[PDB]
C-alpha cells in the first residue's frame with residue numbers, strides 16, 4: 447500500500463539532488479550515503495533539524511529520469527569509511543534510508559511545477575533545489591512502489 451509512504455512524507459521537506467553519473471547513485475543505493483557540496487550540505491543540515499522528514503529525490507544528469515528517493519537519517523559527518531565517488535569538496539557524509547529505488551521518467555512528472563523554482567517543471571532545478579511540500583509529495587507518489595522496502599523501521603526513526 448501507500449499509507450506508510452504518505453505518513454513518512456507528511457510535513458516533509460524535499461530537495462532535488464543531481465548526480466553527474468550513475469555510478470554515484472549506485473554507491474548511494476548500496477551504502478545508504480550521500481555527500482554534497484558545502485552550500486547544499488549547509489542547507490540540508492539546516493533542513494534536517496527543521497522537519498520531521500527530509501527527502502532527497504535523485505536524478506542523474508542527462509538521464510531524463512529520477513532514480514529514486516531517500517530520507518535523511520542523520521546530519522553530515524566527517525571521517526567514516528571512504529566513499530570512492532566517481533568524480534567529474536564532498537565534505538561530510540549523510541546517512542540516508544532509501545524509500546524508493548525505482549526510476550521515474552521525466553515525461554511522467556510533466557504536470558508538476560515547483561513554486562520555489564518559478565513554477566518550472568519539477569525536473570528542472572540545480573543540485574539542492576528545494577521542492578515545495580505539495581509538489582514534492584505528488585512527485586514521490588508518482589514513483590512505482592518499491593516492494594523491497596519496509597517503511598516500518600523508517601517510521602521509528604521519526
Ligand SMILES: Oc1cnnc(S)n1
Pocket residue numbers: 464465466467470471480481482483531536573
Ligand atoms: O555525483 C555526486 C556524488 N556525490 N556528490 C555529488 S554533489 N555528486
Ligand SMILES: Oc1cnnc(S)n1
Pocket residue numbers: 477479525526527528529539540541
Ligand atoms: O555512514 C557512512 C559514512 N561513511 N561511509 C559509509 S560506507 N557509511
